[PDB]
Amino acid sequence: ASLTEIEHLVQSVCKSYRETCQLRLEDLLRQRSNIFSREEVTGYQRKSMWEMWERCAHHLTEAIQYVVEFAKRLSGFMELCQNDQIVLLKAGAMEVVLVRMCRAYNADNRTVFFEGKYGGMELFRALGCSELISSIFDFSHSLSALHFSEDEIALYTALVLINAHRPGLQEKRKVEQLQYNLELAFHHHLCKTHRQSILAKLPPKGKLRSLCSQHVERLQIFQHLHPIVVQAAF
């Protein structure tokens, strides 16, 4: 690939993210002043773990839908065989959701955008998963310290997904090629934006995997007893 082709890949990935980011950064930022009152938090805390599960399940399913859409728009992804598209998304879609969450997180007061307002970790008390919730908040806080641009998120999350080391890939070489081109795109763009400094500050690949594993385990326990049907966005 040439520098023009690399730059075209950059622009393409960034457009794909802009179109599938689900919530606009501008809207997330403007709504930071909109925070759940004490009585609203109490209202959430009083809800059954089952109600909080179905609400959270709905929001997670929706978020995954947008991540899948993002993948489908990535140059080359649709050219991979069906098995490999599934392997990559099965392994990475929830990891991308966790990265995307940092945009909806306010480090100033440790709150997250949830059902239209910002709330702290105590909003989720009824789940009885305080360790997991706290880890998700800590992770988001770590990422917010980097002041990720929209385009850095676009390129970083593309690379979360396009990982040739995922077990079960039938065309590993094709995935390797896509991953390498995306690494070129990411590194080239960091250079063009004087943002080289962020690479060393990104969380180790193992940190995101570890958090996602803990997350999924908790999700499986809820979804096993309480499945839910969710709207899709074509």
Ligand X SMILES: CC(=O)N1CCN(c2ccc(CN(CC(C)C)S(=O)(=O)Cc3ccccc3)cc2)CC1
Interacting residues with ligand X (CB under 6 A): 22-23, 53, 56, 59-60, 63, 100-101, 103-104, 112-114, 124, 127, 129, 132-133, 136, 218-219, 222
Cα separation of 207 and 61, whole Å?
22
Residue 136 or residue 143: which is nearer to ligand X going by CB? 136
Six-digit token pair at 119? 């709330």
Sheet of strand 111-114, all strands in order from the earlier edge strand to the far edge:
105-106, 111-114, 117-119
DSSP class of residue 76 equals T
Cβ 103 to ligand X shortest distance, Å: 5
Nearest to ligand X by Cβ — which residue? 56
The H-or-E segment that residue 9 falls in is helix 3-20
Six-digit token pair at 130? 């305080």
Cα separation of 134 and 149, whole Å?
24
Contacts of 58 (CB under 8 A, 6+ apart): 228, 230
Cβ 206 to ligand X shortest distance, Å: 20
Residue 127 or residue 164: which is nearer to ligand X going by CB? 127
Cβ 129 to ligand X shortest distance, Å: 5
Cβ 39 to ligand X shortest distance, Å: 20
Residue 9 or residue 112: which is nearer to ligand X going by CB? 112
Cα separation of 172 and 174, whole Å?
5
Cα separation of 63 and 230, whole Å?
11
Cβ 182 to ligand X shortest distance, Å: 21
Cβ 30 to ligand X shortest distance, Å: 14
Rg of the chain, C-alpha, whole Å: 18
Residue 33 or residue 82: which is nearer to ligand X going by CB? 33
Cβ contact 166:92 at 8 Å: yes
The partner residues of 113 in beta bridges, in order of sequence, read 118
Residue 199 or residue 228: which is nearer to ligand X going by CB? 228
Residue 28 or residue 164: which is nearer to ligand X going by CB? 28
